Structure 1
Amino acid sequence: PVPTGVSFDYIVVGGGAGGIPAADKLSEAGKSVLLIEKGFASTANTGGTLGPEWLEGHDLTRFDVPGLCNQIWVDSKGIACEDTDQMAGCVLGGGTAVNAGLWFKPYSLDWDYLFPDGWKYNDVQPAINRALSRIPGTDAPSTDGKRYYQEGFEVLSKGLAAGGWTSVTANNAPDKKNRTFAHAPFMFAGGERNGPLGTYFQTAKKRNNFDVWLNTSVKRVIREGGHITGVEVEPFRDGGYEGIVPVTKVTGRVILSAGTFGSAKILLRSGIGPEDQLEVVAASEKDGPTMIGNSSWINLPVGYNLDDHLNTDTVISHPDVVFYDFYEAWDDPIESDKNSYLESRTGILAQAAPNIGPMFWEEIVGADGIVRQLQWTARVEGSLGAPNGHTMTMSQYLGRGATSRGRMTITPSLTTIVSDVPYLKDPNDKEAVIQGIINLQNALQNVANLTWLFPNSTITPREYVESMVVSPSNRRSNHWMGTNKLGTDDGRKGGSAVVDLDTRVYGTDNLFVIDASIFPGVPTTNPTSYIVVAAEHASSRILALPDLEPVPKYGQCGGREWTGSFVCADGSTCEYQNEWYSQCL
């Protein structure tokens, strides 16, 4: 039930990695900010209560404890988003509430390579410095600075060093991403998940010019032509709001932080995206009758440029490797570990599940002269059906420089699907994957008693890869990006860009997108830190824009090539004439 007289300078939709820092920075500016979130309170510091019984009374939830982070894989109900075919957090904090918490200071090349000018490394470096001040990493999240069950790590790390790879502290040497290995850095603090929920959101929630609406889903933005007047909400759970909440007249702005799939969905429901997809929404049961008319539609490649890390698992077994069962930690945690975590915030439970071992990287020049970026995540766990005890999984991510891309589309149910699988469309992407496995095998070839289970010694790396099914189900990294791509090439004219350098949606004066969806591709690394940095950076670009200026009566307020204000001065309205012209009348 949305209140009589309330409006906001900024409305930020979605409480994830993009939305929380954006809403924090914008409310820090003194502007009035409303953060609308689908899900409910998650970590205890947001007032979340949800978790196992051994946490009861200890001021902790399932979202606070690093060693419980893998529960999401066996118990996601009411937490994971249901309007997508992939894995996403639909609680407050979004993906940062449920992810493994890996946190990386950006590799400069990622911004220089992926982004146009104004977003290159020189441009976002102040933003990088802000994000890493708010959240420095720690590669030793146990509050005593000790690390636990490192047997496996020491196995692989010693192996790698002998193979010619160099130890770094990853976030002290962000740019050393080639033939490098490191202790895994996390956004944890005080032995707890922390992150954006622990920093950005906490400073925000203290401000009286800041408001959060939980349990509230944004159906779409309401707009007259290219000017968004408000956002339309319905309760996702009891205590959510039903209605249309306005933004400050003329001057007010909306930011879509709902995620690569969620923000794209909202745009489509708002009559922004490819014709065929808008036409799907228009035909739909839920939205057909109330959708904005097809003459107000803005055609942008929403859902194109779908990107993710290509994940390829590898498994080894070594006798010194010690498995820890983080799943049995949900119900019946080993008591001394329960104890050191609850009293001291120390021990294996202050580390993310499963035990996340050496982190390492290399860059491989392909036949096309394109440098492709590999990241490996070693963790102590079976993967391909290898048994859990002495195994370690080594997961290769194919990152920046990969050329393959997919597409997201929307169902008649208004749920999103990955309908064009992104991975390995281009042969040189595959070559990098194969070469990386070969390269790793070379590094680890002198390690005694080390066994290759996956691929086993009788299968070549090429054969091993060639055998694998290429599908999001077994190959996704849950790093989905790119559906609202940021760029200078206006999508209305056939370009690939959904939003411009200020993250403004082409065809609008006040609508912006800050989340994973704007990245032209995936970075070297687990993307959360990058997404926070992009929010630091985008919110500053937005904050430095001059206030929007209404058009005088008879002036042009719209059209398919219009760059300007879409909103009219008092005493006139924007009126559509044709696809190239709207006038204030």
Structure 2
Amino acid sequence: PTVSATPYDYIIVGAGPGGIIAADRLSEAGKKVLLLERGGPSTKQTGGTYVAPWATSSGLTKFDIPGLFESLFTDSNPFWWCKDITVFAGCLVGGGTSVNGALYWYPNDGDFSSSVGWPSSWTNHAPYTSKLSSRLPSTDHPSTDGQRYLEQSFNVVSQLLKGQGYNQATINDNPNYKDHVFGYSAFDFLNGKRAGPVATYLQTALARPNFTFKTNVMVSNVVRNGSQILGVQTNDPTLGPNGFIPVTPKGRVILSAGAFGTSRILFQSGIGPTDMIQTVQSNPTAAAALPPQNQWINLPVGMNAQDNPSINLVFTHPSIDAYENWADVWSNPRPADAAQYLANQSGVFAGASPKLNFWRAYSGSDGFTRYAQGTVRPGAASVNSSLPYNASQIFTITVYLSTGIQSRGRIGIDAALRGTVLTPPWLVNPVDKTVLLQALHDVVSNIGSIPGLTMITPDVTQTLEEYVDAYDPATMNSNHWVSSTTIGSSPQSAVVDSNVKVFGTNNLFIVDAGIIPHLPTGNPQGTLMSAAEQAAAKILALAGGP
């Protein structure tokens, strides 16, 4: 074939938070970096054009406006979800950060403890968390006017929690203070708009001549001769011969394609468990791209997957404003709220749906301390009540467990090469379940002390125990996948080393949620971003590089 490709010092696969941060920090260091993304534009500044009818004149998209978050789940044509993964994953510029609730918690020291699986060389996360907080300062008042909006559910739940001995704090002012703490939801927004890596890290990268970003490019596999990765195989023939893009002689490939995406690339590269590589091999086309069998690397790719077990509790209280259950924000918003947002990016639309977050630690019979997290939002996705209720008064408390859980599951691919959950990770460990039930019970323990507060799902005829046992396991998915390519010290139990290099390779690295060895206390994006900063630093400091 005749296309001559530009070789790169770093080819980074996937423009999610891991990939973007890596791309920024590596290009900042002067390295010749290529960032590849399978999906298309997201927010306005990336070229995105999917704009609410009411937002036309601003050009701000469904991804730009925080208050449109819940409308990501009610659109008739959600182009933003990865079409070849059976659970939610964002496939567009920014990855999950363009379609998430944007809850943003700086990691606590325990999140990077060696006790949870991080190498000793990672525990001192503070310098990297500091770099993050400078790029993306937390805000719990994202509205540009500094006021907070649609806080009725915060007001009810704060009173519930105060009776349980909780104390209010600005969460991110001291990330280590988590047990019996609640506070306003924090986001990585800027100027009342979604921000995250797309608005910060990507923008500083894009300004550099030594950085190149290509969207609508899918990577099927890395190309390698044993331990030496030569480059990546793409579906774009203008970037190289039949879609192959090489690295420079000392160059490196960084996979940042997300839990399901990265795992698939690895399998399709002959890296992972034998049953997964055989799955690939069962597809004659993909089989032709596999290395010979004697070069397969057996690593626990997709194993030890962890995601929080989420349980929704639904309530009513007369003071709550369920905001039309978010059903009207795209097509027919409350005019004054919409106008406010267009005028100066203040008001309801400057925040996503969450309003209050809380945490509590629990002792376990197995000796592990577990944390529960609550997230309160107006509205509800599902209600199962035998009694009438006023839909305008509904709100949800979603409870999950995080730190200390012992449940592990498994992700991988099916025969159609779709990313899928092979072994559900939720409540595999019985003590996880026991503690979850205790936490749910604690949340509602003093419900009678709040006048007008009613739990409508589970309703009065169903116990919490019955509720959890009847709950669909797949709906416990919190979209917080970690550990599928975990960092560690041995290829028997981990996929990447202390420098996020894949075992068995000279020059293949992973920077995405899969490396995180255990779920952190809060929603994970803040932890991953800190880890991405740390990973980039490690990769840069790792000798033998370009």
TM-score range, shorter chain: over 0.9
1:46 and 2:46 correspond: yes
Give the match for residue 269 of structure 2.
Answer: 270
The residue type paired with residue 467 of structure 1 is A
Q: How does 1:167-178 map to 2 (within 5 A)?
A: 167-178=168-179
Once the 2 structures are TM-superposed, how far is the Cα of residue 163 of structure 1 from its aligned partner? 2.4
The residue type paired with residue 514 of structure 2 is S
Instruction: Kindly indicate whether structure 1 or structure 2 has the higher relative contact order, using CA contacts under 8 Å at least 6 residues apart.
Output: 2
**Separation in 2 of the partners of 1:120 and 1:233?**
33
1:539 and 2:536 correspond: yes
Q: Is the 8 A contact 1:18 1:532 kept in 2?
A: yes
**Separation in 1 of the partners of 2:520 and 2:32?**
33
Give the match for residue 446 of structure 1.
Answer: 449
**Separation in 2 of the partners of 1:289 and 1:210?**
32
Once the 2 structures are TM-superposed, how far is the Cα of residue 162 of structure 1 from its aligned partner? 2.6
Structure 1 residues 117 and 2, CA gap change in structure 2 (3 angstroms): farther
Local SS of the residue matching 1:132? helix
Larger Rg: 1
Give the match for residue 114 of structure 1.
Answer: 116
Which of 496, 520, 523 is the aligned partner of 2:520? 523
Cα deviation code 1:281-331 (max 9, x no counterpart) = 112143023322111111101110111011011111111111113331101
Q: Is the 8 A contact 2:311 2:400 kept in 1?
A: yes
Q: Structure 1: state its 5+ residue gaps.
A: 550-585
Local SS of the residue matching 1:177? coil
Structure 1 residues 3 and 525, CA gap change in structure 2 (3 angstroms): farther
Q: Is the 8 A contact 2:5 2:245 kept in 1?
A: no
Local SS of the residue matching 1:87? coil
Give the match for residue 364 of structure 2.
Answer: 366
Cα deviation code 1:202-254 (max 9, x no counterpart) = 11110111000100000110011100011010049x999961011111x1000
The residue type paired with residue 90 of structure 2 is G
Cα deviation code 1:73-121 (max 9, x no counterpart) = 1225321001111000000000001101111111211211423333543
Q: Percent identity?
A: 39
Give the match for residue 62 of structure 1.
Answer: 62
Q: Is the 8 A contact 1:309 1:399 kept in 2?
A: yes
Local SS of the residue matching 2:505? coil
**Separation in 2 of the partners of 1:402 and 1:4?**
50
**Separation in 1 of the partners of 2:510 and 2:446?**
42
Give the match for residue 161 of structure 2.
Answer: 160
Give the match for residue 464 of structure 1.
Answer: 467
Q: Is the 8 A contact 1:315 1:383 kept in 2?
A: no
Deviating above 6 A after TM superposition, structure 1's stretches of 4 or more consecutive aligned residues are 238-241
Q: Is the 8 A contact 2:268 2:289 kept in 1?
A: no
Q: Structure 2: state its 5+ residue gaps.
A: 385-389
**Separation in 1 of the partners of 2:290 and 2:248?**
23
Give the match for residue 252 of structure 1.
Answer: 251
Q: Is the 8 A contact 2:383 2:456 kept in 1?
A: no
Q: Is the 8 A contact 1:301 1:496 kept in 2?
A: yes
The residue type paired with residue 34 of structure 2 is L
**Separation in 1 of the partners of 2:462 and 2:228?**
58
Q: Is the 8 A contact 2:219 2:232 kept in 1?
A: yes
Local SS of the residue matching 2:392? coil
**Separation in 2 of the partners of 1:227 and 1:347?**
53
Q: Is the 8 A contact 1:160 1:444 kept in 2?
A: no
Structure 1 residues 425 and 30, CA gap change in structure 2 (3 angstroms): same
The residue type paired with residue 46 of structure 2 is T
- Between 1:452-461 and 1:81-90, the stretch displaced more is 452-461
**Separation in 1 of the partners of 2:446 and 2:544?**
57
The residue type paired with residue 265 of structure 2 is I
The residue type paired with residue 118 of structure 2 is P
**Separation in 1 of the partners of 2:409 and 2:338?**
44
* Paired residue total: 538
Q: Is the 8 A contact 1:233 1:241 kept in 2?
A: no
Cα deviation code 1:236-286 (max 9, x no counterpart) = 9x999961011111x100000000000000000000001111111112143
Once the 2 structures are TM-superposed, how far is the Cα of residue 453 of structure 1 from its aligned partner? 1.3
Structure 1 residues 178 and 385, CA gap change in structure 2 (3 angstroms): same
TM-score by structure 1 length?
A: 0.89
Give the match for residue 82 of structure 2.
Answer: 81
Q: How does 1:192-203 map to 2 (within 5 A)?
A: 192-203=193-204
Q: Is the 8 A contact 1:309 1:397 kept in 2?
A: yes
**Separation in 2 of the partners of 1:52 and 1:290?**
43
Once the 2 structures are TM-superposed, how far is the Cα of residue 418 of structure 1 from its aligned partner? 0.4
Local SS of the residue matching 1:419? strand
Once the 2 structures are TM-superposed, how far is the Cα of residue 412 of structure 1 from its aligned partner? 2.1
**Separation in 1 of the partners of 2:121 and 2:381?**
37
Give the match for residue 179 of structure 1.
Answer: 180
**Separation in 2 of the partners of 1:61 and 1:362?**
36
Q: Is the 8 A contact 1:378 1:395 kept in 2?
A: yes
RMSD: 1.9
Structure 1 residues 242 and 145, CA gap change in structure 2 (3 angstroms): farther
Which of 412, 423, 426 is the aligned partner of 1:423? 426
**Separation in 2 of the partners of 1:375 and 1:433?**
10
Give the match for residue 373 of structure 2.
Answer: 375
- Between 1:367-376 and 1:441-450, the stretch displaced more is 441-450
The residue type paired with residue 525 of structure 2 is T
Once the 2 structures are TM-superposed, how far is the Cα of residue 3 of structure 1 from its aligned partner? 5.3
The residue type paired with residue 410 of structure 1 is I
The residue type paired with residue 384 of structure 1 is S
The residue type paired with residue 27 of structure 1 is S
Q: How does 1:279-290 map to 2 (within 5 A)?
A: 279-290=278-289
Q: Is the 8 A contact 1:382 1:388 kept in 2?
A: no
Q: Is the 8 A contact 1:382 1:391 kept in 2?
A: yes
Local SS of the residue matching 2:349? helix
**Separation in 2 of the partners of 1:430 and 1:422?**
12
Give the match for residue 228 of structure 1.
Answer: 229
Give the match for residue 437 of structure 1.
Answer: 440
**Separation in 2 of the partners of 1:338 and 1:487?**
48
Once the 2 structures are TM-superposed, how far is the Cα of residue 545 of structure 1 from its aligned partner? 1.1
